Design a protein around this nucleic acid. Structure first.
Ligand SMILES: [Mg+2]
Ligand SMILES: [Mg+2]
Lengths: 56, 223, 97, 113, 94, 98, 146, 231
RNA sequence: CUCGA
DNA sequence: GCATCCGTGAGTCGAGG
């Protein structure tokens, strides 16, 4: 339940992701760089933030 | 919102990084910009404003017996870091006479009461066998940056007006990064970097800057 | 602008700076008054704009105006989705889509 | 920040002494970045009028509105008397500080473009 | 980029060997609760909590940093597998 | 205007007349014939795509209306004009990579 | 009672209730499949001394990322006037949930000339470029898109 | 040669608009002082705002009221424009009551008077009531700062109350002019003019003063340094 | 199938 | 040594329904 979720679990989440990476993928995956690994920074909002230099 | 912690990191008397976090959304640049403007224009320093050299008519002349031209010597004089120990003093004239095979440093300048040269190892010119250098340099107290043809000062006819680099602060750079406190998400973290010449320390420069600003704030008092 | 000049304010320093830059850009004719040049820019659809963070003007005059913009049905609220584990398919035993 | 101004007001006038060039510029007869010829060598007013001892001074002048980043000027950088804009010096410094190697950074970039 | 990635790539004949070493080392650390680390107390990777600096939970970070010291040995057929397991269990029990 | 009219989004006066009642739910109009016509207003209805379908009254009590005059604005309608969005003040410039 | 707070007497969320992901919209119970309790369940049952209930929770809940305000309910019951559902169906319940969506980062905007883009940043007013008269702009479009 | 304290001039038109001149200032100080004040004025000045709304026989925002032309969403949109001034500094919250009926165009004036509470825009339209139309509201107005969405504060006095987006800022607009001036033989000095538009809840001068105070207080934060524990 | 990249 | 009939491929992901 979303209303049961308290602040501390977010801090815990921050410790969970520390140093870890996720894979970002955009279709169509035309070459290997259509998948890349990134160290995630948690943000408010529902959009993923992608670095400009990797767009190309 | 809890008061931010002010953190300092210095490297001698020349460089300092200043961090202020956390700040309410937007206050990072609200504080950073004015301070940067003040630090570059209003911090009291000293600078070479005028130069006289014997047997030299104008700035684009050349000196017999000296490897550098007049331009190069003037450039070196721009990098001279002179400190006034007595707050009363407004201006000094520094004399320098040397000849023969010698490399003139800032050390060579004839000492004056309550006038400290922070960089005595600074190169001024090299003279050759029979080379003679006789010069008088005017040093004034002021702020900011004043081009040669804007103060245009001359004690004599062949005195060369010099771009006055008063500002003891060489460079200011600041950055604002997003930061969080618990679940306060849009907070600011101000990081200020300050380069000085050594006459005034980065921390001293900042403290003067915030004092100048604080004082200007009191001007909204008596209509 | 006439409103401004009526309210008792002259041309701004920053506006003068931008006008110098604009003269360099060949956007306004050199010799004219600040008002005439600002008017030329405005006729090109451009105005002086101040950076809200610094209060210093953008070094060039900027195209500013009203535009009709729509919000499309593609809202991120309907698109954000994540799964740790969940239902699997009957035959393949692979996650559902 | 790395493009330089090219001006038409001066339009290739000949001058003997640089003080005459500065005079003409003061009158409003020669633009700061217009290609002129003082003595025999080709140059411009800006390269004579503003001669900085180091990048810091030039950028300080930029901050004070003395010159713009695109103005062609004279700056002393790494023991060299360079005729370039403050903007290209700024780019050089951006690279230099990014890579933490002033020498290599100087070798890598193409300054005159 | 990962700190010292160029040196790490310089340490191996194939980048994939670097990955294998880092991964196996990470597993060794996780299996023995980091008690088998070759890092001195001041070299320990840290993570900023709400309280303060604690040990970095990420064993791959640890592994790479250890690899950078030169205190690790890697190669094929250094020791029979079960012998390695038993010796590490003896020195650092789970 | 033709787009709004032909899509039957908005409500229009059937004939000349006087507006008798104005409500968030309904508009009652008295036409020249003397007849009272009541137009119920569709309020906060769900379309196929989940967007809101509702009609807002654009007349007031006692208002004199002619044939084909606007009675209620449908969704995406501003006084009978197709209203697919917003008029905003824009600047055309780069901004810090955002 | 916390989980059942906004449910009416019949087990349907009330009009006007704000529902969030996880919240129940319609309560429903289903008789469990023929349970052969594993020995663990038997022992645990003995420890806590509570009979396992005949029915289980099969309620309609708000899916992740959804929710808002309940604005309408519809209930169709078998054995009632005008109502005949598909064979075997005792009743059908529908709940309508309205939300007011503000523009957010990631929402798609467009003009009539084919210029389109998602909102990447929402700036506070003091950060916006402004006219000399103090009027801030609303939207900043990149010239490179032209 | 050091410039000293400049003249500070105040011009005002009612409680809505104000001009504040400072001259002469050293070169570049018009912006140095002008902009930080503008940033604080637009963002950090405390004010008042309708935070909650209860309407009798209305269960939620997506409703219509019999005999009322406007839907509840539109009514709340109108109430967001209500400007309320508190005379007492201690007063944090007020519940305005509106009881209306019959054929009439309800204005903000129709709220029942409350001690130490003034409505700065009494001509603000709220709803159009028809013959038989009734409207009984309780609006909760709070002190606060900045922009607080209904989703964030969730303020509800009673079960059927509707949270309202709160724009607390009493400042409507801020501009500043930097004009060329001179003193004695010095040229290129700055004349700074702050132009402030408020809603009347607080005066431009009050806003300027607490903005200055906020900035000064922030300058205080550089007072106690600390060694970096990074090394 | 229709829509999106 | 050469035309004729048959079988088979024809981008990705995602969304709605
Ligand atoms: Mg922030
Ligand atoms: Mg010069």
């Amino acid at each position: 339940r979303q209303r049961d979720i308290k602040d501390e679990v977010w801090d815990a989440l921050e410790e969970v992701i520390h140093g870890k990476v996720v894979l970002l993928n955009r279709a169509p995956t035309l070459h290997r760089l259509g998948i890349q690994a990134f160290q995630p920074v948690l943000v408010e909002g529902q959009s993923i933030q992608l670095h400009p230099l990797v767009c190309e | 919102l809890k008061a931010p912690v002010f953190t300092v990191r210095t490297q001698g008397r020349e460089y300092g990084e200043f961090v202020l976090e956390p700040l309410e959304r937007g206050f990072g640049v609200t504080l950073g910009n004015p301070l940067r403007r003040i630090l570059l224009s209003s911090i009291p320093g000293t600078a070479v404003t005028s130069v006289y050299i014997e047997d030299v008519l104008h700035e684009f002349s050349t000196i017999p017996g000296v490897k550098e031209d007049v331009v190069e010597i003037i450039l070196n004089l721009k990098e001279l870091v002179v400190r006034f120990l007595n707050p009363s003093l407004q201006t000094v004239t520094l004399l320098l006479k040397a000849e023969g095979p010698k490399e003139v440093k800032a050390r060579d300048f004839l000492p004056v009461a309550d006038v400290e040269i922070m960089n005595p190892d600074l190169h001024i010119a090299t003279l050759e066998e029979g080379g003679r250098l006789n010069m008088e340099v005017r040093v004034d107290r002021g702020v900011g940056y004043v081009p040669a043809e804007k103060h245009g000062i001359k004690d004599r006819i062949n005195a060369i007006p010099v771009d006055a680099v008063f500002s003891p602060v060489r460079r200011v750079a600041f950055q604002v990064e997003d930061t969080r406190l618990g679940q306060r998400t849009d907070l600011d973290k101000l990081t200020l970097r300050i380069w000085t010449d050594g006459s005034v320390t980065p921390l001293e420069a900042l403290n003067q800057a915030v004092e100048i600003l604080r004082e200007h704030l009191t001007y909204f008092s008596n209509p | 602008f006439g409103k401004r000049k009526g309210e008792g304010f002259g041309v701004d320093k920053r506006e003068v700076e931008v006008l110098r830059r604009a003269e360099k850009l060949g956007l306004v004719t050199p010799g004219k008054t600040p008002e005439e040049q600002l008017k030329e820019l405005f006729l090109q659809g451009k105005v002086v704009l101040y950076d809200g963070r610094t209060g210093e003007p953008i070094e060039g005059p900027i195209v500013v105006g009203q535009m009709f913009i729509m919000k499309l049905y593609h809202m991120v609220e309907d698109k954000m989705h994540a799964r740790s584990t969940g239902p699997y398919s009957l035959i393949t035993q692979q996650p559902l889509g | 920040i790395t493009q330089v101004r090219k001006e038409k007001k001066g339009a290739g006038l000949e001058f003997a002494t640089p003080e005459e060039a500065l005079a003409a510029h003061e009158r409003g007869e020669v633009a700061l970045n217009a290609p002129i010829k003082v003595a025999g060598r080709e140059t411009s007013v800006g390269r004579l009028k503003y001669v900085f001892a180091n990048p810091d001074e030039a950028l300080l002048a930029v901050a004070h509105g003395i010159v713009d980043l695109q103005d062609v000027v004279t700056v002393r950088y790494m023991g060299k008397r360079l005729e370039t804009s403050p903007g290209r010096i700024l780019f050089a410094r951006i690279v230099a500080e990014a890579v933490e190697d002033e020498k290599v950074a100087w070798e890598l970039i193409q300054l005159d473009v | 980029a990962e700190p010292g990635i160029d040196k790490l790539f310089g340490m191996v004949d194939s980048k994939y060997r670097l990955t294998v070493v880092v991964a196996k080392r990470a597993q060794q650390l996780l299996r023995h609760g980091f008690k088998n680390t070759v890092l001195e107390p001041e070299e320990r990777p840290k993570m900023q909590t709400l309280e303060g600096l604690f040990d970095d939970p990420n064993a791959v970070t640890w592994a790479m940093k250890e690899l950078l010291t030169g205190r690790l040995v890697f190669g094929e057929n250094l020791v029979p597998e079960d012998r390695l397991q038993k010796e590490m269990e003896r020195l650092y029990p789970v | 205007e033709r787009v709004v009219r032909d899509s039957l989004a908005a409500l229009y006066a059937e004939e000349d007349g006087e507006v008798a009642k104005v409500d968030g739910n309904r508009i009652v109009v008295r036409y020249e014939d003397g007849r009272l016509v009541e137009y119920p207003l569709r309020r906060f209805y769900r379309s196929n795509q989940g967007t809101a379908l509702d009609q807002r009254p654009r007349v007031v009590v006692g208002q004199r209306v002619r044939k084909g005059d606007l009675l209620a604005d449908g969704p995406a309608s501003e006084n009978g004009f197709l209203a697919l969005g917003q008029n905003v003040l824009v600047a055309i410039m780069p901004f810090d990579g955002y | 009672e916390a989980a059942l707070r906004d449910l009416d007497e019949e087990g349907v969320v009330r009009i006007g209730a704000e529902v969030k992901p996880g919240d129940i919209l319609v309560g429903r119970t289903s008789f469990k499949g023929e349970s052969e309790p594993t020995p663990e369940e038997r022992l645990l049952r003995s420890i806590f001394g509570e009979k396992a209930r005949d029915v289980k929770d099969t309620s309609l809940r708000v899916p992740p990322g959804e929710g808002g305000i309940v604005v309408r309910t519809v209930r169709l019951r078998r054995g009632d006037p005008g109502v005949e559902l598909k064979p075997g169906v005792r009743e059908v319940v529908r709940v309508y949930v309205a939300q007011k969506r503000k523009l957010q980062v990631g929402d798609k905007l467009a003009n009539r000339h084919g210029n389109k883009g998602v909102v990447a940043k929402i700036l506070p007013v003091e950060d916006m470029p402004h006219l000399p008269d103090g009027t801030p702009v609303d939207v900043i479009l990149n010239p490179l898109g032209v």
